[PDB]
Amino acid sequence: VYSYTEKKRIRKDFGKRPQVLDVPYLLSIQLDSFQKFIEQDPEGQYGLEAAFRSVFPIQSYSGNSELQYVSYRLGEPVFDVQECQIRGVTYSAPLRVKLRLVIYEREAPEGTVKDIKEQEVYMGEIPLMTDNGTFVINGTERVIVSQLHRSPGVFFDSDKGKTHSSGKVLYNARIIPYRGSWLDFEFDPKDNLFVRIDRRRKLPATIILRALNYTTEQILDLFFEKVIFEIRDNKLQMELVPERLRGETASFDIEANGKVYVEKGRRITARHIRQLEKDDVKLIEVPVEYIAGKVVAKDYIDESTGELICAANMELSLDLLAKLSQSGHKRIETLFTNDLDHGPYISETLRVDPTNDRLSALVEIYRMMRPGEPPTREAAESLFENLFFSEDRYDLSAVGRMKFNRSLLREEIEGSGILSKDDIIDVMKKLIDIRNGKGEVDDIDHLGNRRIRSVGEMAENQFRVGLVRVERAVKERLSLGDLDTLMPQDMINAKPISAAVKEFFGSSQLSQFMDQNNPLSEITHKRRISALGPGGLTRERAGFEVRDVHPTHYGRVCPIETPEGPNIGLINSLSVYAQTNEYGFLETPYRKVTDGVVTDEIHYLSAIEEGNYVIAQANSNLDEEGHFVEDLVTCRSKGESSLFSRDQVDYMDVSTQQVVSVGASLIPFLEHDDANRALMGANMQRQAVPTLRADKPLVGTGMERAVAVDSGVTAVAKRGGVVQYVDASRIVIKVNEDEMYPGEAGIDIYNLTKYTRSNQNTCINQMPCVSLGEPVERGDVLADGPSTDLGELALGQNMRVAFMPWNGYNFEDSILVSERVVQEDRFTTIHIQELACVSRDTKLGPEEITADIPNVGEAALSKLDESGIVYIGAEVTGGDILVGKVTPKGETQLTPEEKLLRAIFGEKASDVKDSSLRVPNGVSGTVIDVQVFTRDGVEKDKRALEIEEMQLKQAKKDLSEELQILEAGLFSRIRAVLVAGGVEAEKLDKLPRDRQLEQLAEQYDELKHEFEKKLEAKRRKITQGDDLAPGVLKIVKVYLAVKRRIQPGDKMAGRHGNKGVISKINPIEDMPYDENGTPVDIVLNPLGVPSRMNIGQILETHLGMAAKGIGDKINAMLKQQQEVAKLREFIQRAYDLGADVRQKVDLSTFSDEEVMRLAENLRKGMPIATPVFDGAKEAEIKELLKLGDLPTSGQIRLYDGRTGEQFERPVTVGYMYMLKLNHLVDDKMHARSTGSYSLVTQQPLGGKAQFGGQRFGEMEVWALEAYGAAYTLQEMLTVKSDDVNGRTKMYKNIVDGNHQMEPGMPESFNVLLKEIRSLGINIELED
């Protein structure tokens, strides 16, 4: 129950639902996809294997050099995470691929000439997902947010109110593809069913029908029914179709030989259908009234006379059919239809088409597709058919076809991949029966029409496009070479792949810049759902319908969690218990309740099946056995919470967590505070600030350890063992054999994230939590990351907060903070920034990294050495010099009075100058790491050598340790043989340490040869092994880090929804203190509650103090020197107040040494884990507080430290939890008002962070044009903001002093002015 680390810190688990399914790895979805991606796969695991197979084989024609595929071998991590993050190089691994090339002979029955299979082709270096779990490429950790777009199928969205403009509004239908073309289908009450492509116009549905060679006769014979009408004994009989009389009005007496069943007057509803079905009305006497509107499906003329009457598909009028009742006809086959329910819609659409033939109908399509040259047939055929019928590029898998058939009401959930003519007809009929009023409309909100994508899915398709750019670059070589000319590593490319791999893991609109500064910050900015994705929901298309919430999201998607800012509304997070299906779906864990007994068997349902079965919420009271104690419960039938019997319920939600995400589950008592505050809260999560000493949150959910321990932020262990060689760089573990694989002896290597860089200038911080000398377990930690203590997520920090208005210092968001924090570094964040200097090569000659620094002051010298670099560990602030950069002056700059010197005297004694690089305004830290590289082939100055020595020893210092351990082993072997053949304890203890005979003899020697050849190799690599790009040859990489503490204006908040900014620095004890002794540090005002429903301020605070009270008694039960038994029963009450709800007890080992220490670590309160949507309540909280004697009412009376008086009505004071964001103003507070402008014109040079400035636009121009102040208006658009000469000519006088200005001549006018002069216009200024 308790492990090696639980010996020190335990979180009070408190679940209301006795669980059967326990929490899994928090970042499942992400990390295991990485495992599937970069690994040996013998079949086709979604990742590098799926992509390559969906594109392979690469088949060409005439010659056949069909390139086939087998497998691929990868590379393991070469260096440690430490220096990879410090040097600033992509933490990747070489990708070697096994490509097979079978060259066939030109036109011979598969006569293979060569089946040459070559491996390890260099297809780049794929960026590795660290042990932490990020894509470290350009120094900044970047991770891809899993996405979601429209699932393949067909939707029917309403979207009312947007485009009615009269009252005759309609809806829209969009058939969604997977990898192909989207399809538009729209039927309107305007009596016109249209259809078009994304880049099309308004064309009838009959333009595809007639184009598929389906003539008028071929069309209306499929869409409409064949009814056998007959004329017997010279009188019209009719095979009345009741199913085709739905909604029809009874105008004529509907009879059956004398018995009028349906009366003339009241109509047909859905009862008289049965009253006509029961008597089988299929051959009755009827007038010709009812038929005088049907078009014929054949041809009929006078056979007794010899006269032609009509063609095909035409209504038969009063006299025509009468003639067809006297000449010689006994059969009549018209298309049975009416005018209310079933309508002759397409009969009214063929007329819309100007043509009637396939030929010209495609010419109409040619007018749409390509307007230009006079038409023929070539163009048509090609485009159109190869779009929907060619299967090579048009596909739909088994997900698209399912929603097809199921929504089209079929049974087979599989089919083809293309879209056929019979489907064009049938899916059209779908829209047709939805226009009749015999069918209904669906909704996009249904996750069946919502494809939830994994990073791997997105991967295959983006890279699929890359493979086509290169496939049609290889097929040329393949078509030409008959013999064995084309050889491996001469066809496949690398750049189109390089600008693709880097492009997806860090440049596509799926991947985002992960802001690293907290474990959860990483997590929620990593795994979520992003509609921003490629081909997903964009903000210029998705409206209000797309953003609506529906109970069909209960169990997988979180409409709750969606960050504030650029990407808002289009997120709707993925769940922790969520598992992306093999293709595109997502399965939700529900317990099977069989008519009474709730079975612990968990199932996986889809969005169709969820909305198809009766499922119970997480709010379903079970008791004693786990079965419903009640006989009724709220259940979703299709996504509607209604009432159901116990003998009908089929499901119930497993646990109170099998419904939400990382950012949703993380917040305690979500049911009580508003979820929109969780939306805003969603944003704030991925921005938690790195504190130095993270004290633990007094309250949680049980996913706190799920973050801290399982986020990669800590050096975990896959094979537990006795910690051995633990350092601040790498941790070495001696593995125990009960958990050891006999391979490679037993030395597990681990790398630490001990203070390195991060995207937002951050500095990831690792805090060692385990002391040396103790075995670990599979899943045990060594050193937890930022804002974590011994394994608990403490994003911000928990401390004393009181609620009392001071009129001025705390208006809602305004936070009243006390000196304490910033003064003690109990909340300090660290920040490392990075800079670098581009290299040499000039039209004149090489360049030097200064190697000095000419004509400067004393300061600029005491810091730059003979390498041109600043002493690491010096004082680099403001704008001190960092890297000395030399630049070849040039022909263009030379001077008359200086020449001849550099023409006689020497060579480089003058031509070179100094154009170094300095510290960007806004940085005050210390230069730390410096990595430099020199001129490949033709070595640089002394620096080349300074680099070699440096690196040689950096590597030696490590490779020596691990051998000294093993050599200690061989030491033992010799001391074991020596004694038996002559005891020499004292003798070997007096002789130097260098004083199975054949065994040792051989192995020792092999080792020595390696030593030699390896040192040679390293030196070799830095002399001429500098494989770099031409140009980047003398480059520099320098990092500068600054200790940053919170200053007035920083954004602190909470995990709930209330924000805030630190205000005026306040003294220490001028804040009201209490019975404990600690003066309150934070002061806010719940004035926002009576206004917005963020009840956390009343509540979260109350309960916060509760949990700390229990800690105050732990404090008591230890400070009094109490035996382990006293507090043991205290722990029993802690896990057994008086219920059956889980907390999971122990009762197995020594309750002495391993319970007493737990008090020594929980004397700071006892963190409680609460259930998300059915959590702890009032009566429970109070039960705990009466155990000894605690402040059940966390609303204690405060003594004002200003003097010593008591305030009226004791207030809600105690411990709550704050959440500071990454919004440290030192990233945006780079003061700039006057500096340098543009050269060519009045162009503004500045971005968002550094070199900032207020954007004065034309609308702000109107503000100035809106106030009575016309003088500042004058200035603002003349001298203050227009004339480049105006300000210069005036600044050089204001520095001298003169209170008044003069306009001059605006150069802008000088443009317009002369321009019109070319035309013939005159400017005139007289008198």
Partner 1 sequence: LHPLVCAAYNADFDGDQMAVHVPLTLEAQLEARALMMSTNNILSPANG
Partner 2 sequence: FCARIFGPVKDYECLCGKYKRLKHRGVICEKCGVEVTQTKVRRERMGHI
Partner 3 sequence: VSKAMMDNLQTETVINRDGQEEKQVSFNSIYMMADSGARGSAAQIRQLAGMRGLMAKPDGSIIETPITANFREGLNVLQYFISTHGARKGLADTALKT
Contact footprint for partner 1 (CB under 8 A): 808-809, 811-814, 1061, 1254, 1268-1272, 1274-1275, 1279-1280, 1290, 1294, 1299-1301
Least distance between partner 2 and beta carbon 1305 (Å): 9
Q: Provide the pairing of β-strand 651-653 with 641-645.
A: unpaired
Toward partner 3, which CB reaches closer, 363 or 558?
558
Could you say which of partner 3, partner 1, partner 2, none residue 1087 binds, taking C-beta under 5 to 8 angstroms by partner kind?
A: partner 3
Q: Which of 158, 192, 507, 634 binds partner 3 (CB under 8 A)?
A: 634
Residues, the chain:
1327
Q: How far is the CB of 1267 from partner 1 (least distance, A)?
A: 8
1087 binds partner 3 (CB under 8 A): yes
Neighbouring C-alpha atoms within 13 Å toward the C-beta of 201 = 8
The 1298-1317 site mask, x for binding partner 2 (CB under 8 A), equals ------------x---x--x
Tokens 């639980």: give the residue: 6
- Touching partner 3, residues 546-575 (CB under 8 A): 547-550, 560
Please, which residue, 44 or 1303, has the CB nearer to partner 1? Answer: 1303
1174 binds, among partner 1, partner 3, partner 2, none (CB under 5 to 8 A by kind): partner 3
CA distance 667 to 663: 7
Helices then strands (H, E): number in the chain? 34, 52
Question: Closer to partner 1 at the Cβ: 483 or 1269?
Answer: 1269
Query: Cβ closer to partner 3: 69 or 811?
Result: 811
The item of partner 2, partner 1, partner 3, none sharing an interface with residue 813, based on CB under 5 to 8 Å by kind, is partner 1
Q: Among partner 1, partner 2, partner 3, none, what binds residue 1095 when CB lies within 5 to 8 Å by partner kind?
A: partner 3
In the complex, the smallest distance separating the C-beta of residue 379 from partner 1, rounded to whole angstroms, is 59
Residue 544 contact, options partner 1, partner 2, partner 3, none, Cβ 5-8 Å cut-off depending on partner type: partner 3
Q: Whose Cβ is closer to partner 2: residue 963's or residue 1305's?
A: 1305
Count of residues touching partner 3 (by CB under 8 A): 29
> At which residue do the structure tokens 């000493």 appear?
693
Q: Answer with the entry of partner 3, partner 1, partner 2, none that 1310 interacts with (C-beta below 5 to 8 A by kind).
A: partner 2
- Work out how close the CB of 598 gets to partner 3 at its nearest, in angstroms, rounded to a whole number: 21
Closest CB to partner 3 among residues 669, 755? 669
Q: Which residues have C-beta within 8 Å of that of residue 206, sequence separation ≥ 6? A: 219, 346, 349, 350, 352, 353
By CB under 8 A, the residues from 608 to 627 that bind partner 3 are 619
What does the per-residue mask of binding to partner 3 show for 786-815, with x meaning CB under 8 A? -------------------------x----
Q: Rounded to an integer, what distance in angstroms lies between the CA atom of residue 971 and that of residue 992?
A: 12
**Residue 671 contact partner, candidates partner 3, partner 1, partner 2, none, CB within 5 to 8 A by sort of partner:** partner 3
User: From the CB of 1168, what's the least distance to partner 3, in Å?
Assistant: 17
Which of residues 166 and 1300 has its CB atom nearest to partner 1 in the complex? 1300
Burial of 366: CB neighbours in 10 Å, binned 0-12, 13-18, 19+: buried
618-656 burial, b for 16+ CB within 10 Å, e for fewer?
Answer: bebebeeebebeeeebebbeebeeeebeeeebbbbbbbb
Is residue 1202 part of the contact set for partner 2 (CB under 8 A)? Answer: no
Instruction: Please choose which of partner 3, partner 1, partner 2, none residue 1314 contacts, taking the beta carbon within 5 to 8 angstroms, the exact cut-off set by kind.
Output: partner 2
- State yes or no: cis peptide before 57, omega within 30 of 0: yes
Q: What minimum distance in Å lies between the beta carbon of 820 and partner 1?
A: 22
Query: In angstroms, what is the minimal distance from the CB of 1244 to partner 1?
Result: 16
Shorter beta-carbon distance to partner 1: residue 941 or 1275: 1275
CB of 308 within 8 A of CB of 301? Answer: yes
For residue 654, the minimal CB distance to partner 3 (Å) is 18
d(CA 855, CA 864) in angstroms, rounded, equals 13
**Is 1326 buried (19+), middle (13-18) or exposed (0-12) by CB count in 10 A?**
exposed
Q: Which among partner 1, partner 3, partner 2, none contacts residue 1290 (Cβ within 5 to 8 A by kind)?
A: partner 1
Q: Quote the least distance from Cβ 1274 to partner 1, whole Å.
A: 7
**Strands (E) located in 372-474:** 450-452
Least Cβ distance, residue 1254 to partner 1 (angstroms): 6
Three-state DSSP class for residue 1130? helix
549 binds, among partner 1, partner 3, partner 2, none (CB under 5 to 8 A by kind): partner 3
Q: Which is nearer to partner 1, 1028 or 1294 (CB)?
A: 1294
The CA distance from 1093 to 674, in Å, is: 6
Strand-strand pairing, 1213-1218 and 797-803:
antiparallel
Helix (H) or strand (E) holding 1037: strand 1035-1044
Select the residue interacting with partner 3 from 1173, 1211, 1223, 1279 (CB under 8 A).
Answer: 1173
Residue 565 or 896: the one with the smaller Cβ distance to partner 3 is 565
Q: Which helix (H) or strand (E) holds 1017?
A: helix 997-1023
* Contact partner, 1099, from partner 1, partner 3, partner 2, none, Cβ < 5-8 Å per class: partner 3
Distance CA 122, CA 494 (A): 8
Task: Give the one residue of 301, 340, 1099, 1187 binding partner 3; rule: CB under 8 A.
Answer: 1099
Q: Residue 641 binds which one of partner 2, partner 1, partner 3, none, with CB within 5 to 8 A depending on kind?
A: partner 3
- Using CB under 8 A as the binding rule, the residues of this chain from 175 to 214 that contact partner 2 are none
Q: How far is the CB of 1170 from partner 3 (least distance, A)?
A: 13
Secondary structure (DSSP) of 249-279: ---S-EEETTEEEE-SSS---SSTTHHHHTT
Distance from C-alpha of 134 to C-alpha of 1177, rounded to nearest angstrom: 39
Q: Compute the distance between CA of residue 171 and CA of residue 150 in angstroms, rounded to an integer.
A: 18
Q: What's the CA gap between 772 and 615, in Å, rounded? A: 51
Minimal distance in Å, beta carbon 1097 to partner 3? Answer: 11
Strand partners, 1218: 797
Q: How far apart are CA 925 and CA 1042, in angstroms?
A: 4
Residue 899 in the binding site for partner 2 (CB under 8 A): no
Considering only CA atoms, which of 152, 39, 939, 171 is closest in space to residue 456?
A: 39
State yes or no: residue 1095 binds partner 3 (CB under 8 A).
yes
DSSP string, 854-908: -S--SHHHHSB-TTSBBPTTS-EETT-EEE--EEE--GGG--TTTTTHHHHT-SS
Both structure tokens of 1166: 């006892």
- Binding to partner 3 (CB under 8 A) within 652-711 occurs at 669, 671-672, 674-676, 679
Amino acid at 290: Y
Q: Hey, which bits of 526-582 come out as E strands?
A: 557-558, 573-574, 579-580
Nearest distance in Å: CB 894, partner 2 = 15
What residue 1061 binds from partner 1, partner 3, partner 2, none (CB within 5 to 8 A, per partner kind)?
partner 1
Compare residues 731 and 1083 and give the one whose CB is closer to partner 1.
Answer: 1083
Contact 815, 1221 (CB under 8 A): no
- Give the nearest distance from C-beta 1284 to partner 2 in angstroms: 13
φ, ψ (nearest 5 deg) of residue 598:
-80, 105
Residues binding partner 2 (CB under 8 A): 1310, 1314, 1317
Please report, as ranges, the residues that interact with partner 3 according to CB under 8 A. 544, 547-550, 560, 619, 634, 641, 669, 671-672, 674-676, 679, 811, 1087-1093, 1095, 1098-1099, 1173-1174
